[PDB]
Design a protein around this ligand. Structure first.
Ligand SMILES: [Mg+2]
Ligand SMILES: [Mg+2]
Ligand SMILES: [Mg+2]
Ligand SMILES: [Mg+2]
Ligand SMILES: [Mg+2]
Ligand SMILES: [Mg+2]
Lengths: 311, 344
């Protein structure tokens, strides 16, 4: 292919920066050095990771949260992103997971601490299944990909950390299934935006678990036609997320402030995530610096990329 | 000597980030692309400039300002930093008097198109005109005239540094601080501090109310910049830094120079606080506009130090700030950060 067009995406949902996002990014960088430095082969490898500005992802997901909780969340995402990067490449990571657990557990119910360990297990089980899929060089069909990505994208910790940020416990509502539709469309929107923006990286790293590879290699589509398909698919799941949300709100439990708070959380999680995914050198290449552009022509293979108004 | 130790600095003054700092930095990068991309030799050398994160300096200095004014100041600082980097670069300028002066005249002309009625022919002139129309809108006629003097001051400053480099003549400390009041853009910093705080201190300034406040605050700002920018000025053979004055004029080894200037940062920081507290206890100290201006200077002084620990401009391209502020700094490494111990 060489160069494709990413069109304007709907961007219907609030996308806000925590008032302390820039400072939180730096302190998170601080935490990654103290806790995770020895995970990298060199200072060169650590700085490659820190230049992805993954520290600002957290505060872009919870712009509403108390600074302490925003910082806790920012460090969690750097932590799981380090693991996520080695997937694609106490104990070693144990001391880091313990610092996070000690910091986050203090502002969680007992049932939420159980859900966080389960959510991490789900992520790792997702990751493990991606490793086998990649070693065997077998790309799954669309739905199978999405099934693996519910675990691998870390939907359960995305949902739980939303609660943690909003200072609610939706454990009872979850078991009951109040957010089943909301989560289906919300997580699938999150995943497909990510698939679209992380394609340069996953293409380069031969990662298998992405709907761009499924559309290209298993459905045999041209890149532009796959990009146009998933872009339309993002609009679907985003509009249905809004519909399913508006239904919980209009419905029986929708007057509750805890439900309203959690759903406003997901709103900012979905819009904030996309803002980050345009920002990060992780997707646009080491050396890239975001200029604020959000659509246009971009290179699949160039070491660094950005949206231009012509090929 | 391949490294030095930077002790903890007092950091008594507030260092706040604008609640929109990250987004403003990005929008500032967008403005540098739109306006200045063709001032760089290539996309790669434009990215080298943007990786310095100069776009977050503005929001770290006026964290209390309305978003639009913060954005204007952010774009301003990226623009002057592009200019500072161009005219301190002998490759871009020339390595001999004749050539340096020709290229410098061109820059002076281009930047004077800034407040003119006609469209600018130059990239620098068009960037200056955009910033002029944006900032001057929110200024009094007196502030606008002061903005003209302040650019004139900056350029007189840069020209004395350029001459100094060419003639291989390091100034004595007081000459260095005289030059740097101009070359550091102090008149701009004070004016923009007024604009951010939405006040007009034209009379007060002329009357001399802030003479001690400005003398001590600007000296702290310049000294802290000389310390954090030495890594890069050493490599670039710049002469207008107190680190080079103490080493070459006064005969001091690097570590003694560094220790002396850290003590001087503390002297001028406390002197700033005393001079400021005096105005606040004086007959103008009750005025809301004076209170806002002096809080604006507090945040300029604290904010600037935070930025100078953050920027890859000083710690090397590829560097990423981890929040550390004290320890051992390599002069030779391609990327530097503060460490607990010297290289064995
Ligand atoms: Mg991945
Ligand atoms: Mg993954
Ligand atoms: Mg991805
Ligand atoms: Mg200069
Ligand atoms: Mg300079
Ligand atoms: Mg300097």
């Amino acid at each position: 292919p060489g160069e494709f067009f990413l069109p304007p995406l709907p961007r219907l949902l609030p996308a806000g920066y925590h008032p302390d996002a820039a400072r939180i990014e730096i302190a998170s960088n601080g935490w990654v050095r103290r806790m995770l430095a020895d995970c990298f082969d060199s200072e060169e490898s650590l700085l490659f990771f820190l230049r992805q500005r993954n520290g600002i992802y957290g505060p872009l997901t919870v712009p509403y949260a108390e600074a302490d909780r925003a910082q806790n969340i920012a460090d969690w995402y750097q932590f799981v992103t380090v693991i996520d990067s080695f997937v694609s490449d106490a104990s070693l990571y144990g001391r880091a997971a313990q610092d996070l657990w000690r910091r986050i557990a203090a502002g969680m119910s007992a049932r939420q601490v159980d859900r966080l360990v389960a959510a991490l297990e789900a992520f790792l089980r997702g990751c493990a299944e991606e490793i086998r899929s990649k070693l065997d060089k077998q790309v799954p069909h669309f739905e199978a990909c999405m099934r693996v990505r519910v675990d691998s994208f870390g939907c359960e910790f995305l949902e739980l950390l939303t609660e943690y940020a909003a200072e609610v416990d939706m454990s009872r509502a979850a078991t009951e299934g109040l957010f089943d539709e909301v989560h289906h469309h919300g997580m699938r929107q999150l995943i497909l935006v990510n698939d679209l923006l992380s394609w340069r990286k996953e293409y380069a790293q031969r990662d298998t678990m992405t709907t761009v590879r499924v559309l290209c290699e298993v459905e045999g589509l041209e890149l532009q036609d796959a990009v146009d398909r998933l872009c339309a698919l993002v609009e679907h799941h985003e509009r249905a997320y809004i519909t399913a949300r508006d239904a919980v709100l209009a419905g029986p439990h929708g007057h509750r402030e805890d439900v309203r708070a959690y759903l406003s959380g997901l709103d900012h999680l979905i819009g904030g995530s996309q803002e980050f995914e345009y920002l990060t050198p992780r997707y646009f290449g080491d050396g890239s610096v975001w200029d604020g552009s959000t659509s246009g022509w971009i290179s699949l293979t160039a070491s660094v990329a950005r949206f231009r108004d012509a090929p």
